[PDB]
Amino acid sequence: FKVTYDMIGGLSSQLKAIREIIELPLKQPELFKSYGIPAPRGVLLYGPPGTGKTMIARAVANEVGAYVSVINGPEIISKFYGETEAKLRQIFAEATLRHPSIIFIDELDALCPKREGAQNEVEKRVVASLLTLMDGIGSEVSEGQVLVLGATNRPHALDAALRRPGRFDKEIEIGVPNAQDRLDILQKLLRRVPHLLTEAELLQLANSAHGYVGADLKVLCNEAGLCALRRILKKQPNLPDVKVAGLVKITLKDFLQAMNDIRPSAMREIAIDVPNVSWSDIGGLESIKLKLEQAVEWPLKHPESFIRMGIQPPKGVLLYGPPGCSKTMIAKALANESGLNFLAIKGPELMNKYVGESERAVRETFRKARAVAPSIIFFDELDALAVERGSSLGAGNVADRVLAQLLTEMDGIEQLKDVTILAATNRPDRIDKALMRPGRIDRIIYVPLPDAATRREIFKLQFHSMPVSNEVDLDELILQTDAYSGAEIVAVCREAALLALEEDIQANLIMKRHFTQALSTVTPRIPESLRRFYEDYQEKSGLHTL
Amino acid sequence: KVTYDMIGGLSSQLKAIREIIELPLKQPELFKSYGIPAPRGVLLYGPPGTGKTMIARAVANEVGAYVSVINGPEIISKFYGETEAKLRQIFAEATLRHPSIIFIDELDALCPKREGAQNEVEKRVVASLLTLMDGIGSEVSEGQVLVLGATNRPHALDAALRRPGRFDKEIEIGVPNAQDRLDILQKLLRRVPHLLTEAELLQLANSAHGYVGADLKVLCNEAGLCALRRILKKQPNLPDVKVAGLVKITLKDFLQAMNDIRPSAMREIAIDVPNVSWSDIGGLESIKLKLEQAVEWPLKHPESFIRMGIQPPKGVLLYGPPGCSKTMIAKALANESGLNFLAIKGPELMNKYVGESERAVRETFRKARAVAPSIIFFDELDALAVERGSSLGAGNVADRVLAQLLTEMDGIEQLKDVTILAATNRPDRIDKALMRPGRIDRIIYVPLPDAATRREIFKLQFHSMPVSNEVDLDELILQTDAYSGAEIVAVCREAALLALEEDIQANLIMKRHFTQALSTVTPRIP
């Protein structure tokens, strides 16, 4: 009533899923009993905090019309020993009286932490009592009516026996929201506030909200109204609260100035982003793009011809070359062209002295990947984790653990039903051939160094954002830019602009003489030997190259 | 309401426990005929949900005499006396109900070890249990009162229980098998309207890897609910009066409900007779011959050759360069001679589980002995058989787990009709301490494949890949020497890839395909 579905945005798909898993039994219960079929005791909600799943809980609660009864994670565990179990049992029974009842718990990990991870045996007594009570929910008198609802961040630290049949089967993830979902929840929230915004720049503002969560969006709206009030005040000293209140109007600049005031919360879990980069911002290389689309596409429709050929289709595509040199750009670009989801995991980032936790991050990564099955995992600079063991005695341990679990996930290949994996690195040798074992990553390309047309395209993309003079010349610049990297060539033209601006701080143009000066200053820190070794690995890889 | 047939498969131990329970009650005179004590405490053990409770209830049906199910934690009340005296009442009734049987569920809760039981109420009630059990020995009670039991984990038990007269019959029941998977499928679906067919069920069961009885019950129930969901999603104004009968399960229900299932298959012990064969990869006849000698002869030939009984060795290490289809050969022999194969790979053992690693080792060895005609196995055991000392952060566990491994294997006589196969490709890596003879003695080197093996594998590929006849095998043979089986099949895969990459609808791997394949491949023989 006060928490209607009409006051929660985003999560639409999950909304429909929960509606399914709940309504038909909770609205046609004897129509389930007539099936001779059991009714789901409860479902496990999970997702990082901040999205305050309590929202969804009370929402469905006061919509469907159940005997609501709620407890909280740390709030339930007082300094009592079984008296908390007494409280539990008492709520359980009294709600069983009103068969249309729903019990929910947040942070159920708190009440029942890890067995080996919790010293207090009383907590495990509470665990056992919870088990018995939940079997009392698998009871005949009220078969499938006392819906238990568990919600916490960590699925790991939960008690294993809870995931056994008829105890906690359906695990619904509610992850950090999405750009479109951000916009939706923001709109539905803002619904009842006077403002002067247009949904296009609104979508812009939404784009701005990386790593942001709902709760923080509410805080944003509040603070924005606050600062607009501040503005109106700074325009009028001592007007009466009535006339002030009659004048506040939230605008764009309001939200903008509001933004930098409060930090978003999550910014920690790898969100299901959307590739924002453009094929347009690439120095051509369309032959490579064609090879890439062909690779990623064939296992979708061609399998019926592959089995005709009688051979296992390939999955893993890998790129190698100089560092960062437009490669990752190509990766994200083909990701966007594919119209899929991006799950980036940078190599050296995987070093946290919280042992195994990196592995666990990888695990939840793959879990979400599956959950969003049409998608693409990405890797970069694999050699970071791929320094061989024995060199560092301690750090190599977590390295072996994470790479092994990575092999586990990946080599779970069948379930990767057209879920392609793309990686890229610089020195492909440094990795273990376990990843290069056939079946996993059997498609590769040396990213070719920028040729003439490529460099000219880079130059176009760079001139299209700076006021440049007319004395520019494509010819000589392309000439003295060999053995360089497109990105660092962009750095060259930036430095030339810097020099021009240093000559006169007001000069609205840039001088190609200063460009040549920059060319002299910049040196190619990439020797030809790197090209040599690259081509030699290309040839003597003993691999596909195709 | 649950006959024995209703129990998912495992008919063997079913009949076993059947006789072992009925006949004592029937004629104790048969035990006493051969001067035998009447076995009192039986106990089953295995991963949970497996049928513990199902077996319990089903025998509770089939008995024809008294049964008193006693769920474990239910008696746990910190009020002293209540637990033990309640047991006392149980046993008094047991007396009055002379032909009967008593079972205890989740008995592990009652008997945690003193290192685990951080309550001494546990220890005293264990004491009282022992008193009870021994007290059952009343001659009038003999042959009439009988004890049952089952755990979640036989390891979490207490040593004081398997003592004589108390607990001897430790029957194992765990992960089912292919035929058992299909069986339990049929038993579950015995009374459900289904849209399934025979071969569909066959391949479905084939797709099952680690599932358990109640778990498969969940599976089929969720498939049925998915079918009901599809039906009511076609038209949403259908009350159950028009839907409770028409709904039936196709494969799609199974797949959908399946991809969201983790069938407790993270760390198990698979008695999985593989599908490999000699025919899968031939050649190296002398190697397979010497190996089957070293494994099989010590039961027949050195018996007939105890004449010159130099020694029939046990531990074999028959290894050469990597990638030479070694583990393939291992599985091959294992299935061809007819032994139940097991496996513990070094890498998959590379875990920080102190003791639990050695624990898995011990459990595997015990299962092996339980299926005694068989072959234990190790792959890349040098992963934890690393050169000692070089790894102070990972080899400190390695030395002690190897010592435990010793402690087990060192039953050279426990190793009667049980062999061992580690694996590596660097003999210098191996430690001669584990070669001080007695345990692991015989050694073969498996060299690089030859032209014969080359043309063998190529015949296999062209038998498994539609190829153009114009590419004579002998050209490869003239250019495929100093290659490896793995490398060679990679070559064939790449030639196929070229064939499909030039023409996406081609049907003949032509000469240029193999040519550029050679260009893309190489004998990586460093």
Curated annotation (Swiss-Prot), chain B:
Binding site for ATP 1: G46, P47, P48, G49, T50, G51, K52, T53
Molecular function terms, GO-annotated: ATP binding; ATP hydrolysis activity; preribosome binding
Catalytic activity: ATP + H2O = ADP + phosphate + H(+)
Activity regulation information from UniProt: AFG2A alone display limited ATPase activity and is not regulated by RNA or DNA binding. In the context of 55LCC heterohexameric ATPase complex, the ATPase activity increases and is stimulated by DNA binding and inhibited in presence of RNA.
Entry keyword annotation includes Transmembrane: no
EC number assigned by the record: 3.6.4.10
Bilayer-spanning residue ranges: none
Gene Ontology biological process terms from the UniProt entry: brain development; cell differentiation; ribosomal large subunit biogenesis; spermatogenesis
Residues annotated as binding ATP 2: G320, P321, P322, G323, C324, S325, K326, T327
Placement of covalent cross-link Glycyl lysine isopeptide (Lys-Gly) (interchain with G-Cter in SUMO2): K511
This protein's GO CC annotations: cytoplasm; cytosol; spindle
Localization: Cytoplasm; Mitochondrion; Cytoplasm, Cytoskeleton, Spindle
Keywords of this entry: ATP-binding, Chaperone, Cytoplasm, Cytoskeleton, Deafness, Developmental protein, Differentiation, Disease variant, Epilepsy, Hydrolase, Intellectual disability, Isopeptide bond, Mitochondrion, Nucleotide-binding, Phosphoprotein, Repeat, Ribosome biogenesis, Spermatogenesis, Ubl conjugation
Domain of life: Eukaryota
Domain notes per entry: The first ATP-binding region binds ATP with low affinity whereas the second ATP-binding region binds ATP with high affinity.
Family: Belongs to the AAA ATPase family. AFG2 subfamily.
Record function comment: ATP-dependent chaperone part of the 55LCC heterohexameric ATPase complex which is chromatin-associated and promotes replisome proteostasis to maintain replication fork progression and genome stability. Required for replication fork progression, sister chromatid cohesion, and chromosome stability. The ATPase activity is specifically enhanced by replication fork DNA and is coupled to cysteine protease-dependent cleavage of replisome substrates in response to replication fork damage.
Assembly: Part of the 55LCC heterohexameric ATPase complex composed at least of AIRIM, AFG2A, AFG2B and CINP. Associates with pre-60S ribosomal particles.
Disease: Neurodevelopmental disorder with hearing loss, seizures, and brain abnormalities: An autosomal recessive disorder characterized by intellectual disability, intractable epilepsy, microcephaly, abnormal muscle tone, and sensorineural hearing loss.
Name of the protein: ATPase family gene 2 protein homolog A
Shown segment, full-protein numbering: 349 to 874 of 893
